[PDB]
Point group: C3
Chain length 138, copies 3
């Protein structure tokens, strides 16, 4: 189906714009790409930020503890699945450039749940991030 | 064409699901995404696994020689080409997380040949993996 | 829209083929994917190559200063935007394999401007590359 394909591109576009905002420190913008009740589980062991204000607050607190740095998130291996929410499985690779060099990792399998807002744009209802280092740790 | 575009997304979805299975150690599942006569040339110098049982066996033997580890394969730079088989050229980046850290590489140009099975889903008839370290080696 | 989606896949296909040519040292081929007046700003601080002959010349001079090596460029996080030119924002990760190992980085945010040539194929009118190490440098 042409619609399935269109949805796939749409999710890629959505995800890209989210990370363009995040990576450039536009935390409000990033939060606005989630539903008003959005769940953001960024780190295993830690409770998710729920809601836009919590996501923005969480990002601010994390930036205060750990940032002269440029982070880039790179998504690959998108697979989507099902009458109005879509699940998205994919891989994230974190890159961090600092004055003393580039760091690669961690790699993170992620599950997103996406819905369509009142204006027809996609919003992220849920982002559930796992860390491969945590998985290996045992 | 909307169909060309749809095919492109379809191949991306197919490839993602293949690697989700592989990376999580679901070797039977991965093998089932190939044709029953599928060719899997994973390593230069070594003969391909041909057929699903050979792919599963090959993966098992490799897991026995070399695996407390989590591997992720990341595909980028997909280009497809032609009345019923499609050729796919792309790049693979291997990531391996172990207790003592993350390894990046090798990078591998790959050619896939894809066909459509009796139920209309894509299957991989052929996967031909080159290694950039082997290429540089001279 | 099915056309928006089709355009997104089209840009991905275009970009992939460009890098397949570049990475394999087919500089003329790469240059032919730009408009005859194409702007290629590969490095901050340095003036862009403008025109196909300048791009080919620039690539030759760079290959002469710095190349037994295999480079791969990996694009992720494509976002496109607008009646006949399209802007494309995305991330590039450079990988370089040499006899003594693999190098990862730099990471480069890039903006492309794409138009359609007389035969309907996409051409790159402009490629503006930023380097995250340059950004961090301050």
């Amino acid at each position: 189906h042409w619609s399935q394909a269109a949805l796939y591109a749409e999710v890629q576009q959505h995800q890209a714009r989210q990370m363009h905002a995040l990576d450039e420190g536009k935390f409000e913008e990033y939060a606005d790409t989630f539903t008003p009740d959005g769940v953001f589980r960024h780190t295993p062991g830690r409770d998710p930020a729920i809601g836009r204000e919590a996501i923005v607050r969480e990002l601010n607190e994390f930036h205060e503890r750990y940032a002269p740095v440029q982070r880039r998130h790179m998504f690959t291996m998108l697979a989507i699945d099902e009458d109005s929410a879509v699940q998205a499985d994919f891989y994230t690779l974190v890159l961090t450039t600092r004055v003393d060099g580039l760091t690669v990792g961690p790699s993170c399998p992620v599950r997103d749940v996406l819905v369509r807002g009142a204006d027809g744009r996609l919003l992220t209802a849920s982002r559930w991030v796992e860390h491969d280092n945590r998985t290996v740790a045992e």
